Design a binder for this molecule. Structure first.
Ligand code: FMN
Ligand code: FMN
Lengths: 183, 183
């Protein structure tokens, strides 16, 4: 698939089903994430692959975080069900470090860019995904399940799989005037 | 190029010269930025196109930022000279709004993803770019020059142009195992 076409028409997909990207297709997704722009080459990322019984362990972790947060019954139920919306989830942690020339937000930003690169590498291979976050990225229970230190941050849960719908190509390209200024 | 190839091999380039992307090719870069993932469709981005006399204006702005902060003459001179490292610069501001379901960091990451998408769109079309930031993204006078409110943030100065260095050997893709855990 053509690179410019992907960038101009990049779309996510929330309706995701088996098969998940696997083997070398999954490795391609992970390597795209590891090519994110990275001030100082700190490689400030850690990825967690959630699939098979990992999805159940993820469900239990989110439930516990929802209860620990004091969410209501609907919130706990949504957390329990959240992992089963895709066959594969990749949690991306910004693994940050004290550095003179690289503020923490730029390392967090690099990890965020890894999420989007990973979604586009799925899309490039006939899969798709959606970057999700929600309040439980800040849950102490959930942060501990992904080995976060105090200075680390969960920047996304990237749900991945085979979309029900081929990525639309009929929609027209975005327009620019509200957003672009000559300096 | 092929999309998966661009993502797996994505490289920035610091040594850039004329010709800058222009016309349709520049508009394609801007449309790619506007396809960034965006929680809640807040569209939380403003882009500033910096070229020709705008590059000189940008130079004076950065120079003033360094001077007001008390930098020495070498820091002031380096700020003054910074914009002339590329024929075209796109400043990206995260234009953030308070939404209970969309924390400000997610809006900032959408704007950061727009920078990367824009660099990839240059690369896809035979140009390239480098995402730069540095300490003067926080300078009050620089932020005012880009119309930042208190809740807004400069997330990058994207330097753009035609690569000057010869195309080098394709670099090895990274091993995924040190960064990846099965949850
Ligand atoms: C940091 C970040 C967090 C996001 N979190 C969510 C989320 O929790 N739920 C959701 O529906 N979309 C979320 N989004 C937006 C989706 O990833 C996606 O962009 C949205 O569904 C629009 O679809 P599109 O990407 O095809 O334009 C988030 C985006 C970003 C950049
Ligand atoms: C948010 C952000 C800000 C950055 N700022 C700078 C910068 O000011 N100077 C610089 O040399 N690299 C900066 N980088 C890293 C470069 O854009 C680029 O990734 C780096 O030169 C490595 O080259 P590569 O992208 O080909 O791997 C930044 C990266 C990010 C994500």
């Amino acid at each position: 698939m053509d690179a410019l076409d992907l960038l101009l028409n990049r779309r996510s997909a929330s309706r995701l089903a088996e098969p998940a990207p696997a083997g070398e297709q999954l490795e391609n997704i992970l390597r795209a994430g590891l090519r994110a722009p990275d001030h100082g080459t700190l490689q400030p990322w850690r990825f967690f692959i959630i699939a098979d019984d990992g999805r159940e362990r993820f469900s239990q972790l989110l439930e516990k975080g929802a209860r620990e947060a004091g969410q209501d019954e609907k919130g706990i139920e949504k957390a329990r069900n959240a992992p089963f919306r895709a066959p594969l989830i990749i949690t991306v942690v910004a693994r940050c470090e004290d550095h003179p020339k690289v503020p923490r937000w730029e390392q967090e930003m690099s990890a965020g860019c890894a999420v989007m690169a990973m979604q586009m590498a799925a899309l490039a291979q006939g899969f798709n995904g959606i970057w999700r976050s929600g309040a439980l990225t800040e849950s102490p229970v959930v942060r501990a399940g992904f080995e976060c230190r105090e200075q680390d941050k969960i920047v996304g849960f990237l749900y991945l799989g085979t979309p029900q719908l081929k990525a639309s190509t009929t929609i027209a390209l975005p327009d620019t005037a509200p957003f672009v200024t000559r300096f």
